[PDB]
Design a protein around this ligand. Structure first.
Ligand SMILES: Nc1ncnc2c1ncn2[C@@H]1O[C@H](COP(=O)(O)OP(=O)(O)OP(=O)(O)O)[C@@H](O)[C@H]1O
Ligand SMILES: Nc1ncnc2c1ncn2[C@@H]1O[C@H](COP(=O)(O)OP(=O)(O)OP(=O)(O)O)[C@@H](O)[C@H]1O
Ligand SMILES: Cn1c(=O)c2c(ncn2C)n(C)c1=O
Ligand SMILES: [Ca+2]
Ligand SMILES: [Zn+2]
Ligand SMILES: [Zn+2]
Lengths: 107, 422, 96, 48
């Protein structure tokens, strides 16, 4: 996480670059795991956020019963959706997809 | 605990016995056409297990139907009961309909949801139990006494869930999909009682090959001009029947040559069913099943009558009925097309897509793979829920508070980080 | 599937309105055979054009007249117009 | 032609108003933007 944050929040180096490519199979072992997103952290500028993706959830979300619900939700959004509700329905989808992720995880 | 193991097996294995039930009903009605008439009976062609394996496969079909609906009872029923609890609670909090609204005679769904607040275990999934006391003590001061009232209030005799379970049955029985599969079960039972109409289970091709939402697709694009247009066609044929009945009281002969006890169209009622059943299903027009106009002083009128009127009817009206129905399919295919294309050129979150984002090789591919990916928001919410409320970082707790506040402007609208650089 | 459903219904009720012979003085032909009924409805009613209301008994004087008129009219213009027209539409749109 | 004119009355009315005549492109960025335009700003009966 730290090395990715260095290399991404400061690219265009000469200093880091030799160290950057030096011994990184960790990066190979940890690019199924780091999740990167983008937000606006009240400073009115886009600030990428790095975090953990649980190993009991890539299997839980790439399997069916949920992969089924994904396309249905994408269809109901892009089919018809106003320019404001987009995200509120998206987070409703997020919350009950958590609920289904939970009760499919107990199976 | 074997019942726990069994229901978890059915819920993990649910999307395969749909295919199995379709295959079984398909293979049964492959056989069911082998009948004749003696009272109805089945012949024997090649291999003498026709009757017993029909008996076996009807048994197996009905078992897999009941099997499947119990598997669906243990599956998505919590998801929809969850969504309904979430909607009820998040309209008690930010709106409080049972404080102020007491909603109108339409939208009876919330009116049925009125029957669930005085249970014991109201928000029983909802990831939660808490918001009941929060709402009914945040509003329970200048609407005090009644809400403070309605907040608190083997050997098992009456110590199970009563009103919530009745409400749950009420919400389950208003489903599309559950009611569909329950009708499918009852048709399995009555087709087990009478194997003639057992073939109604080829209607489950409505969820056929790569067309999983065809019920919503067919419900959506109903134009309802078509009902008004069929009404127009009926009015034109009825006007015609008025005219032909009120003048042409001899040119109809259902018999042959009049030596037989001839049949001249007279009954108005029949004259109308005749013109529908015959002239619409003619194709060549009503100028076929008619007296020939040779040698009559209404010959000119009847030729003008027939030619103009019924090519004006059948060509124009039946062609535009056909045009409405085919254009419905055209709208189906157009929306199925401009979901996929503008999703695959311009994403959700950026909402600008590969124009100034275009110049990077594999550009939009890298956008949706690394940058946002729409599950990293979901996995992010897993992460940002499952930690403690003291170990967030700055941005992390900030996003948590904006989520709890329901503000929704921390998603980057109109610009992303790669475009921000310049 | 729609024609097979139809054959199920017509076979299971209308066990007299089919006559391939002429007037019944000839040794008349009702098509009771389910197998034949289905090939009959394909080969005849689809290749009809005018619909299956042609090669049929006339409904004059029977207590299933209303049912058979509703049956024939609604069902087979619903079949031939819509289904055959959109088959034609798919093939022409391929050229498009 | 009937259905096309009945369609592009409604759609381009509901994206670009009378009075502005540019609509929700640089007016777009406000949430409920064009809605607020036709509700508050001009509303075509406030002229009347
Ligand atoms: N913001 C976004 N969120 C989600 N998906 C996006 C976004 N932007 C683009 N996409 C597209 O979503 C597609 C997902 O790929 P694909 O559909 O092959 O897998 P899938 O979604 O698992 O499959 P299915 O849709 O059949 O479930 C990608 O091609 C990508 O172009
Ligand atoms: N400059 C404008 N003047 C008038 N109406 C406008 C203007 N710009 C946009 N509109 C649109 O007019 C619509 C009026 O809303 P709506 O049609 O639902 O009510 P209405 O006009 O009373 O209904 P109806 O058209 O059936 O009488 C709004 O959706 C708005 O988008
Ligand atoms: C336990 N829990 C929560 O506590 C929660 C939540 N969403 C918000 N909160 C607050 N989810 C999905 C959740 O499972
Ligand atoms: Ca701390
Ligand atoms: Zn984006
Ligand atoms: Zn304006």
């Amino acid at each position: 996480v730290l090395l990715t944050n260095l290399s991404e929040h400061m690219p265009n180096d000469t200093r880091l670059q030799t160290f950057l490519e030096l011994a990184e199979s960790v990066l190979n072992y940890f690019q199924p795991f780091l999740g990167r997103i983008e937000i606006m952290g009240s400073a009115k500028r886009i600030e990428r956020v790095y975090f953990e993706i649980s190993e009991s959830s890539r299997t839980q979300w790439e399997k069916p019963q949920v992969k089924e619900s994904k396309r249905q939700f994408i269809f109901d959004v892009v089919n018809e959706g106003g320019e404001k509700e987009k995200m509120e329905l998206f987070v409703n989808f997020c919350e009950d997809t958590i609920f289904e992720m939970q009760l499919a995880a107990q199976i | 605990a074997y019942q726990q193991k069994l229901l978890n097996y059915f819920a993990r294995n649910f999307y395969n016995m749909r295919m199995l039930a379709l295959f079984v009903a398909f293979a049964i009605n492959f056989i069911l056409l082998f009948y004749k008439v003696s009272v109805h009976y089945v012949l024997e062609e090649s291999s003498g297990y026709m009757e017993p394996t029909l008996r076996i496969l009807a048994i197996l079909h009905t078992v897999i139907s009941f099997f499947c609906i119990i598997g669906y009872y243990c599956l998505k029923v919590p998801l929809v009961i969850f969504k309904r609890e979430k909607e009820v609670a998040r309209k008690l909090e930010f709106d409080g309909l049972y404080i102020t609204e007491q909603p109108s005679e339409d939208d009876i769904k919330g009116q049925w949801d009125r029957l669930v607040i005085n249970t014991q275990s109201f928000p029983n999934n909802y990831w939660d139990k808490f918001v009941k006391r929060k709402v009914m003590d945040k509003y329970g001061e200048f609407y005090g006494r009644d809400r403070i009232s309605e907040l608190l209030g083997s050997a098992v005799l009456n110590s199970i869930d009563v009103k919530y379970q009745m409400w749950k049955l009420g919400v389950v029985f208003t489903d599309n999909s559950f009611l569909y599969l329950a009708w499918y079960m009852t048709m399995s039972v009555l087709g087990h009682y009478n194997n003639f109409f057992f073939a109604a289970h080829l209607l489950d091709i409505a969820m056929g090959f790569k067309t999983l939402r065809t019920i919503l697709s067919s419900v959506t694009h109903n134009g309802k001009q078509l009902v008004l247009t069929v009404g127009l066609l009926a009015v034109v044929v009825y006007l015609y029947t008025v005219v032909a009945f009120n003048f042409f009281r001899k040119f109809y002969n259902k018999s042959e040559d009049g030596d037989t006890p001839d049949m001249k169209c007279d009954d108005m009622l029949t004259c109308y069913m005749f013109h529908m059943y015959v002239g619409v299903r003619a194709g060549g027009g009503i100028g076929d099943e008619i007296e020939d106009p040779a040698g009559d002083e209404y010959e000119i009128y009847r030729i003008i009558f027939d030619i103009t009127f019924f090519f004006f009817v059948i060509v124009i009206l039946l062609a535009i009925i056909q045009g409405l129905i085919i254009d419905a399919f055209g709208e189906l295919r157009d929306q199925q097309e401009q979901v996929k294309e503008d999703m695959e050129t311009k994403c959700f979150i950026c909402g600008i897509g590969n124009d100034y984002f275009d110049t990077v090789p594999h550009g939009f591919e890298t956008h949706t793979l690394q940058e946002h990916n729409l599950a990293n928001y979901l996995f992010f919410l897993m992460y940002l829920i499952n930690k403690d409320e003291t170990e967030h970082t700055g941005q992390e707790s900030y996003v948590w508070k904006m989520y709890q506040e329901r503000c929704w402007e921390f998603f980057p609208a109109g610009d992303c980080f790669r475009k921000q650089y310049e």
